[PDB]
Design a protein around this motif. Structure first.
Motif, mmCIF file in Angstrom:
data_model
loop_
_atom_site.group_PDB
_atom_site.id
_atom_site.type_symbol
_atom_site.label_atom_id
_atom_site.label_comp_id
_atom_site.label_asym_id
_atom_site.label_seq_id
_atom_site.Cartn_x
_atom_site.Cartn_y
_atom_site.Cartn_z
ATOM 1 N N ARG A 71 4.468 6.382 -4.239
ATOM 2 C CA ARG A 71 4.965 6.475 -5.641
ATOM 3 C C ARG A 71 4.236 7.621 -6.354
ATOM 4 O O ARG A 71 4.885 8.347 -7.130
ATOM 5 N N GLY A 80 0.827 -1.222 0.000
ATOM 6 C CA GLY A 80 0.000 0.000 0.000
ATOM 7 C C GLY A 80 0.851 1.258 0.000
ATOM 8 O O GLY A 80 0.793 2.017 -0.997
ATOM 9 N N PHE A 81 1.623 1.468 1.071
ATOM 10 C CA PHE A 81 2.497 2.656 1.263
ATOM 11 C C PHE A 81 3.332 2.895 0.000
ATOM 12 O O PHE A 81 3.324 4.025 -0.517
ATOM 13 N N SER A 82 4.036 1.856 -0.458
ATOM 14 C CA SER A 82 4.929 1.862 -1.648
ATOM 15 C C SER A 82 4.171 2.396 -2.868
ATOM 16 O O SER A 82 4.689 3.322 -3.529
ATOM 17 N N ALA A 83 2.985 1.841 -3.137
ATOM 18 C CA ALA A 83 2.139 2.164 -4.309
ATOM 19 C C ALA A 83 1.583 3.586 -4.182
ATOM 20 O O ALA A 83 1.656 4.330 -5.172
ATOM 21 N N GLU A 84 1.049 3.948 -3.012
ATOM 22 C CA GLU A 84 0.379 5.260 -2.796
ATOM 23 C C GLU A 84 1.422 6.388 -2.774
ATOM 24 O O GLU A 84 1.119 7.465 -3.319
#
Ligand SMILES: Nc1ccn([C@@H]2O[C@H](COP(=O)(O)OP(=O)(O)OP(=O)(O)O)[C@@H](O)[C@H]2O)c(=O)n1
Ligand SMILES: [Mg+2]
Lengths: 746, 486, 733
Positions: B422, B416-420
């Motif tokens: 980005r 989640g954190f990684s994707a959001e």
RNA sequence: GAAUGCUAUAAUAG
RNA sequence: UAUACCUCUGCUUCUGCUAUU
RNA sequence: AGUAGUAACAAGAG
């Protein structure tokens, strides 16, 4: 000390250039646990939450609670609106029709002429489909078979004709049947004599009993969609619900999608159905023109876009209008045929998964509450979150444990058609002859809008307009996710454009592993993935050569097949080491036989067996490539050889049929449960087919065609074979008399 | 109709656009800086920078895992014989006695002359592996009658603050060792110049990582998760002592077996892929748990003697933890080798990029520097609030580490954190590129990132690093404020 | 005598009343449904399930047979197989050790025919084995994404035709209706049947092996100067983004693929030679060292009889008999008289859409040929006049007429275009309208014939006309006749024009095709500076790179000599990717802006670097003495191939914060090679020729003036300029 | 101096 | 009840659509 | 206990 910061790379190298480092795809994907009922209920609530201000009524067919947002009151805020306006959907499509003349009828023609050729077996290539006869998901091929066997009992032989159309006719006919009758198996005990003390043995035999259901109970199951949770949902925190559809409704969706595909293929802004290199090409070409066409002095702006609640907000009754408007010049029957799929979806029923588990910590007792028995216990016994969910579910819930769901598409059922409705928004380009012009790309919900205007203040007027236009089609742009910048860079379907779509190696990294087909295959796959990544995903020769090593390790550890010269202890390794010693041409041995890996960048695309064949021992290759080996299962001598062999598929990977091309034993969980009986049903069909294939060797290769009985076909062939075997002199009088006599009995 | 509808539609409906200014980009996840929240604990499966392998120089050709684990302790008998529990730290809900008894059962069983590494299902091992702790299934008929039976409240990941040990892990895992772990097998002889360039280019890339701490840790994680999965299927209804083993080669080219500790595998009747198998880890470590106490709430530590680290007598501790894994995590563990690729590729891209400019193989140039070009450097980190530059090799290693941590702390929170985030990383890159970016609901965009930041150490630290870097960028921007301004 | 056994088994099977009713009810069609019937849910995580299942005792399932029974139960205390029979195979289950055992101490089977069966692959290997590897090159490569053949075929057919041939080979009886195809591949059917005759490999494998080498596997890939399948198969080793590798495959290479690439070489030589003074010099210089795979261009042009204008120009330039021989796919012509003027025009077609096509003017005569049929053609601008032909093969005559009808571009031919005709590809790429119209009317001919019109046949000596059915008929196609009846020393100008011994020209470099395309085989230029024949982005990058390299000298030499260092071989190449009709105008602009920086103290190295290359083409000013003013400088290729004067662009942008120049994605540091004053020194000055900054935006002056409004100002007049979003400037003449 | 349109048990994307 | 310190099982405890084909 | 995280496993079945 000196504190490292990995984000400090972005100082040197720009984000897009090194986007690979932002994808954590060496890490584990999110999997679900227990029930999907919660996640299903959420969708069911939210779908109606965006339609609640629409026209609510009671279906005098199903008896269900139906809600109709279409032509509803226009939104007062930016909360997801499903209240699309037919007029505006049609106007959008008229402009599209003007911009692409003849395309609608041109597609309709193709889609129609397809359906006429399309057989029934077309349905037997859709993973796990919902079977109404047992109210569980099942293999597409079985889910169909059950429906065909069931239909025959209700006097519906349309299937037997072979075309999809007459089978489809039987489905919409089946609704008008007062009761629907179907086989469902029951166990029966029976004494069987055996070398036994008591002198016999009891065994349970399956018996097909004729179950019946009412006109309604059937209709609901026909309109039913079973629900799960999406597992391995990458780059997301919380899980989401997915839906599988009925063999009844799967038929009509194929044609409506096929229609929208034909339309999409010939659109400038359609991201589907084109893919990978074909897509990158089209989008690179699209960006190039829309960039250069910008007015000199004026500003070109790219809105990296994403729509929120794509499934929940889109309405079936809109999809109905789309077909009716797209097939305007198509004949009466095909106009109606297309109209079914949306009509089913506008009365569809969502199944609520497994249920909810209730427990006592003090007692250490757990129990699953079936979806039918959700309102059995007082809602105080459920948790806060579930209480509200059930409260909001209440007015759409059905006593049999399902949810009425008139609005919404649901996960991915109409992608092609939704893409068209998306493009239709991009087809407008301007509102009120203002000082801007929009045009973009659409791939389902995912969209990238280009706006060429005089200044960025005006661009915003265009975006704000596009937003308002989409709101009238039931398309809600995510203000949170979606963003905008000056043209030159954007993101689309996790393709990152920076003056040219960048390389993102990380995304397809998981595919480098041991695929899990078998030794012979996973080698080929493993090398082909490297070969292809070296081309498409920009993997340099060092990383590529390393990838080979890292694969060979995974392979050697997985299939426990380390170098014959190695001293890695193991059960297979003991014999591998004996083969290493026994063999002279050790360089000829395959990795799986503890042989040395001789793959490099240049020979990735040659099969391991073909590479080493020239330097194998004759005995070793003689064993490895034995024509009638037991691991693969070839042809035969004619004792009674009839296994449950599946159809030999044409996989893209290049591998030779050798002893390492084996098959795993079937999961035997089925032996404990009552599903046992299905193995006999399988091994029946297996016996029938396997023998048929002995009569017709072509059947294995190309699909045999005929509406006559299999027995009929088999008989004649064997008669001819026998006659000409006698006349030629391959068969004797004694044998021929027996042949004509035995065939006579049939 | 579209005109007619847009005309009569409420003005309140709009994208409400705003031009992004640097000052609008506030720090993400401000809670991580709140000291009143608890320090995020070390929650990994195995120890990393705090690890300690006992060096057992082998003949070079392998032996059985019990045999090497025995012979390894046989050398370090002073530790193996230590029967007196000198307890330092206890896990809140743990049993000193049971755990120590278990350790001793492992040591004895792995030390004995028998073939088997099976453990008698004792009252301690039963508590440790969690015997019959599963709830009993009953009929919905009976369930419904019982009012005391209720749907449990979902357990949530609690909020935590930034922890130094996360930063320290990166730092140490990133750094150079004398020891090579990686087991990279043979390749076909090179013919095409591409292959000769690739092979020569590997010598720089592969080694630079192989001679770094992260590599050994990764290989340990793999080779453990292999034998664990092999045991899990084979010995389902058996408690088993799996030794935490790993082969290492020193500069001089001598093969040392490294025993980092003993693990015990509970009954592994693993039907589903998520279905858990409790694994109890006993790991050797020089690290004093008293130092960073808020790092080790999940662990139970026993002082078990000392060792000469060089001229220093470092006291040897034993980190004992009840842990768990599943079929998936175990498989992904064996597929952790691919960390090399994600990192190697990203830098090979820069080598190949720079090679196009200079017109020759810039491999040797980027690392060391040739007669024409001086070596390639990267902004690597901070030192009392001042930016520091590091080597191409360092920059490479830092990524390879990051990719390992992407596995070791890989979960739903990270994904989640990684994707959001980005999404925000790009909005920054637009400000950097000077492509006047616009946003519609920045708060909503932030919340999506900030809800992912809970109790994942790598997430919590990535937020700190992101916030730190953002600050350093935000400064750099100033240079451009006054350009072509007259 | 396998027949009896099957009948005997049918009697056994038909005793199961369940099987009986299945056989009696399930149709031959429905076989396809019940074949795929199974219990097994599809394995979603096979990578895992395999890794796990490999650790089990007996993961694999034997097929119940006497061979399965040759495997022992245990070997030296290793449980190889169990008694328990698998659900699927209904045979004993075994451990992976079983395979390893069989491969070691198993029976030695007969591997006869194997090589012939799997020839397809052995050739794939043989090509790598008998290959030759050249040098690796480090530099920019513009990879183009195009649909290519993945695997070399024995003979290419549509899947339907291919499948029908395989049936004729492997399954004669179950073939169905005999098709034309059957006779067309009679040689291949017999040839394959005789090769696969003695084999024990399962027919279903032989099916897919033939399918592999008859059915075309054709997919999109990023390629660069290599389309040929025997190259594509190796594409991973051929090139990257930033490096190239020379690789000569083995076996054979087609004369057609040798030809089609040989054209691109010549076109690319000419395209670049046109810019230099004495183009013939450079044309010759390159051509002598131009290698097609392993074969010299001169040798190739000599050996091959055919090709386009460019091939003849280069042939003349080298000194070879120019063949005015021509091709149009199936049709192949040779000019007797005429001169063709290709004008791009908007043609309406029968379905009712407007397609842009290059139409040819003038009355020309050609020696048309198609298989065993020959003829003489006469055409004028979009009208066939007269077509004489021989009475060879019925279909060869039928094809030649359709090819000649299309080739003529007759307004009647465009009228007969009814149905769907794709000029644009699924990926929005251009397909050759004439080569698609040719391809369409070869499938649907009856439309063309009826949409053309008939007339009375000729009543001459040996002239007797033919109708639709290609029989000596009374009514013949309007201007078609069938008959019984079936060079000169040139010189080439330095400016590349083929003059006759009289004086009239036959070809010129102005007559060659402007369309660059992916060469079938690998084109190599054995002279240093081969990059000069490269793509727009390649040339652009390689140029600016060479500017950066020698910036030390080039910048200094500029501050001493004015126009001494404008003439450089790099900037020459660079001109060949500038539109010739703006080349001079751009130079006119750039030199003024450069000289404006040198003389008026206001320098800008990033700009100097950007514009310097444009300053080669002899300057082209306006009639009023002042140079042309530009916002962007468009180059040859896609709409992204342009250089922005004021801002950055997809080819060229400078980052002052990092002091980093970005060229086609590749990042270069201008640290050290930058003056101290530049940072604070505005760009406004080096944006327009004879224009310099006075102050900041003056609302009194009004909005920002366009190129036109700027060009139309009298010296010492103020104006508002915008360099890029949020940088207003007040500029004066 | 162009084409040839497809249609996996993997992986990725939405 | 009992056999049962026995026996069977380790994705089948609902895994979808559409592309890359 | 623990894994884990919006709901599960911590063996299931005759
Ligand atoms: N596993 C998936 C992912 C996506 N989709 C399709 O792609 C659409 C877009 O998915 P996504 O953008 O991820 O979510 P949204 O539907 O926009 O939902 P949200 O409002 O949460 O963004 C879905 O609606 C569905 O049609 C799908 O069918 N299956
Ligand atoms: Mg969305």
């Amino acid at each position: 000390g000196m504190n490292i910061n990995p984000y400090f790379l972005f100082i040197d190298v720009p984000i897009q250039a090194a986007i690979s480092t932002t994808f954590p795809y060496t890490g584990v994907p999110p999997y679900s646990h227990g029930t999907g009922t919660g996640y299903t209920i959420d969708t069911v609530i939210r779908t109606h939450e965006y339609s609640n201000k629409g026209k609510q009524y009671i279906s005098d067919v199903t008896g269900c609670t139906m809600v109709d947002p279409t032509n509803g009151p226009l939104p007062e805020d930016n909360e997801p609106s499903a209240y699309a306006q037919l007029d505006c959907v049609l106007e959008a499509l008229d402009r599209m029709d003007e911009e692409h003349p003849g395309l609608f009828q041109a597609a309709s023609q193709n889609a129609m002429e397809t359906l006429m050729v399309t057989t029934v077996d077309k349905l037997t290539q859709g993973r796990q489909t919902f079977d109404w006869t047992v109210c569980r998901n099942q293999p597409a091929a079985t889910a169909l078979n059950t429906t065909i066997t069931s239909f025959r009992l209700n006097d519906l032989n349309g299937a037997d004709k072979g075309g999809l159309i007459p089978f489809c006719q039987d489905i919409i006919d089946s609704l008008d049947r007062p009761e629907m009758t179907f086989f469902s198996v029951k166990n029966i005990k029976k004494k069987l004599p055996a070398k036994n003390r008591k002198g016999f043995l009891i065994k349970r035999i399956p018996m097909k009993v004729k179950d019946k259901i009412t006109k309604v109970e059937y209709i609901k199951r026909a309109l039913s969609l079973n629900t799960m949770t999406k597992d391995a949902e990458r780059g997301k925190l919380k899980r989401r619900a997915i839906a599988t559809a009925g063999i009844q409704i799967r038929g009509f969706v194929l044609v409506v999608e096929n229609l929208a595909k034909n339309i999409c293929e010939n659109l400038e802004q359609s991201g589907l159905p084109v893919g990978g290199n074909e897509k990158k090409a089209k989008l690179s070409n699209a960006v190039a023109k829309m960039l250069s066409n910008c007015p000199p002095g004026g500003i070109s702006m790219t809105v990296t876009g994403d729509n929120t609640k794509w499934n929940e907000c889109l309405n079936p009754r809109i999809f109905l209008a789309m077909t009716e408007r797209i097939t305007r010049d198509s004949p009466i029957w095909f106009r109606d045929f297309c109209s079914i799929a949306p009509v089913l979806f506008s009365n569809k029923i969502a199944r609520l998964g497994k249920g909810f588990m209730i427990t006592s910590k003090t007692k250490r007792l757990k129990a699953q509450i079936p979806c039918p028995d959700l309102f059995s216990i007082p809602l105080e016994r459920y948790n806060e979150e579930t209480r509200a969910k059930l409260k909001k579910l209440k007015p759409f819930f059905n006593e049999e444990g399902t949810a009425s769901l008139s609005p919404g598409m649901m996960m991915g059922m109409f992608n092609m058609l939704s893409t068209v409705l998306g493009v239709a928004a991009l087809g407008i380009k301007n509102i009120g002859n203002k000082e801007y012009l929009w045009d973009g790309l659409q791939s389902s919900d995912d969209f990238a809008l280009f706006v060429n205007a005089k200044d960025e203040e005006t661009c915003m007027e265009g975006i704000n307009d596009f937003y308002r236009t989409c709101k009238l089609l039931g398309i809600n742009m995510s203000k949170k996710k979606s963003y905008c910048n000056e043209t030159g860079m954007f993101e689309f379907t996790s393709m990152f454009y920076r003056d040219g779509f960048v390389s993102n190696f990380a995304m397809e990294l998981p595919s480098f592993g041991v695929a899990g087909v078998n030794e012979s295959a996973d080698m080929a796959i493993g090398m082909t993935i490297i070969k292809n990544n070296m081309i498409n995903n920009g993997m340099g020769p060092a990383t590529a050569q390393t990838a080979i090593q890292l694969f060979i390790a995974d392979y050697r550890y997985t299939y426990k097949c380390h170098r014959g010269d190695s001293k890695v202890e193991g059960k297979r390794m003991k014999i591998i080491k004996e083969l290493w010693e026994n063999t002279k041409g050790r360089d000829g041995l395959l990795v799986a036989d503890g042989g040395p890996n001789i793959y490099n960048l240049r020979n990735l695309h040659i099969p391991e067996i073909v590479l080493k064949y020239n330097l194998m021992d004759p005995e070793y290759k003689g064993r490895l490539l034995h024509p009638q080996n037991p691991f693969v299962g070839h042809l035969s001598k004619e004792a009674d050889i009839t296994p449950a062999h599946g159809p030999v598929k044409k996989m893209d990977y290049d591998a030779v049929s050798g002893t390492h091309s084996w098959r795993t034993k079937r999961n035997r969980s089925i032996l404990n449960t009552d599903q046992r009986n299905m193995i006999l049903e399988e091994q029946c069909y297996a016996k029938c087919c396997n023998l048929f294939e002995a009569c017709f060797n072509s059947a294995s290769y190309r699909k045999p065609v005929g509406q006559h009985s299999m027995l009929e076909a088999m008989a004649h062939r064997l008669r001819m074979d026998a006659r000409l075997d006698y006349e030629s002199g391959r068969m004797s009088k004694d044998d021929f008399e027996k042949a004509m006599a035995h065939l006579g009995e049939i | 109709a579209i005109e007619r509808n847009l005309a009569r539609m409420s003005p309140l409906v709009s994208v409400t656009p705003k031009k992004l200014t640097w000052e609008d980009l506030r720090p993400i996840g401000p809670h991580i800086y709140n000291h009143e929240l608890p320090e995020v604990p070390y929650n990994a499966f195995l120890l990393m920078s705090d690890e300690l392998g006992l060096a057992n120089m082998t003949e070079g050709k392998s032996k059985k895992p019990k045999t090497l684990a025995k012979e390894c302790l046989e050398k370090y008998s002073t530790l193996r014989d230590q029967t007196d529990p000198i307890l330092i730290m206890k896990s809140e809900k743990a049993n000193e006695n049971f755990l120590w008894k278990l350790w001793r059962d492992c040591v004895n069983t792995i030390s004995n002359e028998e073939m088997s590494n099976e453990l008698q299902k004792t009252n301690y091992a039963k508590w440790a592996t969690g015997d019959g702790l599963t709830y009993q299934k009953i009929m919905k008929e009976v369930a419904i009658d019982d009012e005391t039976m209720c749907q449990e409240e979902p357990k949530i990941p609690n909020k935590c603050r930034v922890a130094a040990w996360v930063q320290t892990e990166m730092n140490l895992l990133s750094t150079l060792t004398s020891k090579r772990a990686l087991d990279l097998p043979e390749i076909g002889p090179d013919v095409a110049p591409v292959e000769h360039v690739g092979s020569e280019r590997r010598k720089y890339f592969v080694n630079e990582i192989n001679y770094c701490k992260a590599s050994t840790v990764m290989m340990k994680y793999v080779l453990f998760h292999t034998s664990l999965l092999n045991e899990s299927n084979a010995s389902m209804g058996k408690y088993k002592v799996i030794p935490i083993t790993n082969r290492v080669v020193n500069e001089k080219g001598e093969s040392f077996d490294m025993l980092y500790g003993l693990a015990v595998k509970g009954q592994s009747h693993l039907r589903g892929d998520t279905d858990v198998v409790t694994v109890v880890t006993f790991e050797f470590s020089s690290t004093d748990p008293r130092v960073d106490s808020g790092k080790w709430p999940k662990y139970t530590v026993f002082r078990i003697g000392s060792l000469f680290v060089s001229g220093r007598e470092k006291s040897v501790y034993l980190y004992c933890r009840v842990n768990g894994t599943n079929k998936i995590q175990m498989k992904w563990g064996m597929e952790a080798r691919r960390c090399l690729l994600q990192s190697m590729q990203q830098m090979e891209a820069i080598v190949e990029q720079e090679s196009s400019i200079q017109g020759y193989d810039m491999t040797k140039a980027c690392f060391k520097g040739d007669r024409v070009n001086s070596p390639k450097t990267f902004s690597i980190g901070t030192q009392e609030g001042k930016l520091v530059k590091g080597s191409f090799g360092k920059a490479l290693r830092v990524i390879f580490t990051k990719c390992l941590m992407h596995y070791v702390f890989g979960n739903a929170q990270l994904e989640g954190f990684s994707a959001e985030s980005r999404r925000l990383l790009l909005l920054i890159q637009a400000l950097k590129d000077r492509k006047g970016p616009w946003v519609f609901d920045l708060e909503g965009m932030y919340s999506g990132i900030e809800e992912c930041i809970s109790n994942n150490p790598w997430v919590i630290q990535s937020a700190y690093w992101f916030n730190e870097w953002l600050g350093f960028e935000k400064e750099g921007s100033k240079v451009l404020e006054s350009v072509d301004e007259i | 005598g396998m027949t009896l056994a099957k009948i005997e088994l049918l009697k056994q099977l038909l005793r199961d009343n369940e099987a009986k009713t299945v056989l009696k009810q399930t149709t031959v069609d429905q076989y396809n449904i019940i074949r795929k019937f199974n219990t097994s849910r599809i394995e979603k995580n096979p990578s895992l399930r395999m890794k796990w299942a490999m650790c089990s005792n007996f993961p694999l399932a034997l097929t119940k047979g006497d061979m399965a029974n040759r495997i022992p139960l245990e070997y030296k205390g290793i449980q190889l197989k169990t008694n328990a029979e698998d659900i699927g195979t209904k045979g004993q289950m075994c451990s992976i050790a079983a395979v390893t055992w069989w491969n070691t101490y198993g029976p030695i089977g007969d591997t006869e025919g194997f090589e012939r069966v799997y020839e397809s692959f052995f050739l794939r290997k043989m090509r790598l084995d008998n290959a030759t590897w050249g040098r690796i090159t480090f530099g920019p490569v513009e990879r183009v994404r195009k649909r290519v053949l993945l695997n070399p075929l024995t003979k290419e057919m549509p899947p339907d035709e291919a499948s029908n041939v395989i049936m004729e080979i492997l399954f004669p009886k179950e073939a169905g209706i005999p098709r034309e195809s059957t006779w067309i591949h009679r040689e291949l059917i017999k040839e394959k049947r005789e090769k696969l005759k003695g084999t024990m490999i399962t027919p279903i494998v032989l099916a897919y092996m033939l399918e592999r080498e008859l059915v075309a596997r054709r997919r999109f890939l990023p390629v660069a100067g290599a389309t040929s399948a025997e190259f594509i198969e190796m594409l991973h080793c051929l090139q990257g983004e930033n490096w190239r590798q020379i690789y000569h495959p083995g076996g054979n290479k087609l004369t057609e693929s040798r030809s089609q690439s040989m054209i691109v070489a010549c076109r690319k030589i000419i395209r670049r030679s046109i810019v230099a003074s004495n183009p013939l010099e450079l044309a010759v210089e390159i051509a002598n060292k131009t290698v097609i795979d392993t074969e010299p261009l001169k040798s190739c042009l000599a050996a091959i009889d055919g090709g386009d204008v460019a091939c003849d120009i280069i042939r003349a330039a080298l000194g070879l008999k120019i063949r005015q021989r021509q091709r149009f796919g199936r049709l192949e012509l040779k000019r007797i008289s005429g001169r063709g003027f290709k004008n791009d025009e908007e043609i309406l077609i029968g379905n009712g859409t407007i397609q842009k096509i290059g139409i040819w003017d003038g009355e020309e005569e050609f020696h048309v040929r198609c298989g065993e049929c020959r003829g003489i053609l006469k055409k004028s601008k979009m009208k066939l006049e007269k077509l004489l032909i021989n009475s060879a093969k019925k279909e060869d005559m039928r094809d030649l007429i359709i090819l000649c009808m299309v080739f003529s571009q007759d307004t009647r031919m465009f009228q007969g275009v009814r149905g769907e005709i794709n000029f644009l590809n699924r990926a929005g790429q251009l397909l050759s309208p004439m080569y698609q119209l040719q391809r369409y009317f070869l499938n649907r001919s009856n439309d063309l014939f009826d949409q053309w019109g008939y007339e009375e046949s000729p009543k001459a000596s040996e002239l007797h006309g033919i109708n639709e059915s290609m029989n000596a008929s009374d009514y013949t196609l309007k201007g078609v006749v069938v008959t019984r009846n079936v060079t000169e020393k040139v010189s080439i100008t330095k400016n590349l024009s083929l003059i006759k011994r009289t004086g009239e020209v036959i070809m010129g470099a102005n007559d060659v095709s402007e369309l660059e395309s992916q060469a079938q085989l690998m084109i190599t230029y054995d002279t240093p500076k081969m990059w000069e024949m490269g793509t727009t982005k390649e040339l652009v990058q390689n140029t600016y790179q060479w500017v950066l390299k020698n910036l030390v000298t080039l910048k200094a030499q500029f501050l001493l000599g004015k126009e001494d260092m404008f003439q450089w071989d790099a900037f020459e190449a660079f001109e060949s990717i500038i539109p010739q009709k703006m080349a001079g105008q751009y130079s006119g602009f750039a030199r003024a802006v450069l000289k404006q920086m040198r003389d008026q103290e206001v320098m800008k190295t990033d700009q100097f670097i950007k514009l310097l290359p444009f300053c080669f083409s002899p300057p082209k000013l306006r009639s009023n003495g002042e140079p042309y003013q530009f916002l962007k400088l468009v180059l040859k290729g896609g709409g992204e191939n342009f250089i922005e004067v004021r801002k950055g662009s997809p080819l060229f942008s400078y980052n002052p914060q990092t002091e980093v120049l970005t060229i086609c994605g590749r990042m270069m540091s201008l640290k050290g090679k930058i003056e101290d004053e530049e940072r604070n020194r505005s760009m406004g000055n080096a944006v327009l020729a004879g224009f310099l900054v006075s102050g900041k935006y003056d609302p009194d002056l009004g909005d920002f003036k366009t190129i036109e409004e700027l060009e139309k100002l009298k010296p010492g007049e103020k104006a508002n300029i915008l360099l890029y979003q949020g940088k207003p400037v007040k500029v004066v003449k």
